[PDB]
Design a protein around this ligand. Structure first.
Ligand SMILES: COc1ccc([C@H]2C[C@@H](c3ccc(Cl)cc3)Nc3ncnn32)c(OC)c1OC
Ligand SMILES: COc1ccc([C@H]2C[C@@H](c3ccc(Cl)cc3)Nc3ncnn32)c(OC)c1OC
Lengths: 5, 125, 125, 5
């Protein structure tokens, strides 16, 4: 996996 | 919202699973006929990848057809290669098939594939 | 073949286009009912993202239903957030919705979403 | 974009 898009 | 988190691999995982549905013939809803060959697929994936299929399946009459016949000049192996690209992101481009793949991609209105075919042809001339 | 080239953005572009079909209500083939709310979607995308929908739409009777009613304990906003994640890879996780999102993800059998919910809850305790 | 996967 999860990221800040 | 601007506060979302994103799962990087999600889109790739969805496409892998749509190709597994196609392999198992699950919820396929159209047969594409290319001369003597038939290919089963999902209309939504075809529309999402091809300008020609987007036009066909948004037409008020053609959206309901379960069989679509392509032009007899389309090469079945070229179509097979492009259908596999639609469902996997991988294009099996070879010296022996590039002209057929490029012609099929022009007909299906798949500009990114046409562009790489043109680049590979130009590099060999 | 082992000789393929790959278009990096393809899977993401397909998902963007499937979400545009959903927004325009093009070729949607199922309505999911969550208490008083209805959500139109494509069965193949739901199956590709959720273990519960994969089981439902591979069942020989349920694959033909045009309406699926979820358990009344499922929160509609939690379902909406997860349906948007299915079609975009982005999860709108907030303090105000995380418990409902996690419960909905457990019911839909979406383990990656359950995992991030558990991590965010654990960080606040 | 195109790459060698
Ligand atoms: C952001 O604007 C658009 C986005 C997407 C589409 C079409 C493109 C069409 C398509 C055409 C060519 C290729 Cl290579 C791949 C897909 N498939 C599709 N599924 C859903 N929507 N769309 C559009 O065409 C109506 C758009 O207005 C130009
Ligand atoms: C490589 O092995 C498999 C790959 C994919 C599936 C299921 C998973 C299912 C799914 C379950 C959970 C989640 Cl989070 C997302 C998707 N969706 C799907 N569409 C097509 N196939 N499959 C499988 O379940 C039958 C597999 O054998 C374990």
């Amino acid at each position: 996996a999860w990221v800040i898009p | 919202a601007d506060s979302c988190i994103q799962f990087t691999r999600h889109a790739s995982d969805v496409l892998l699973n749509l190709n597994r549905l196609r392999s198992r013939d699950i919820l396929t809803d159209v047969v594409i006929v290319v001369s003597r060959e038939q290919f089963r697929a999902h209309k939504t994936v075809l529309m999402a990848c091809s300008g020609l299929f987007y036009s066909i399946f948004t037409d008020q009459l053609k959206c309901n057809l379960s069989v679509i016949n392509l032009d007899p000049e389309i090469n079945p192996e070229g179509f097979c290669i492009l259908l596999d690209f639609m469902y996997t992101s991988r294009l099996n481009l070879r010296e022996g098939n590039i002209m057929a793949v490029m012609a099929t991609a022009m007909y299906l209105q798949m500009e990114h594939v046409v562009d790489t075919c043109r680049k590979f042809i130009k590099a060999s001339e």
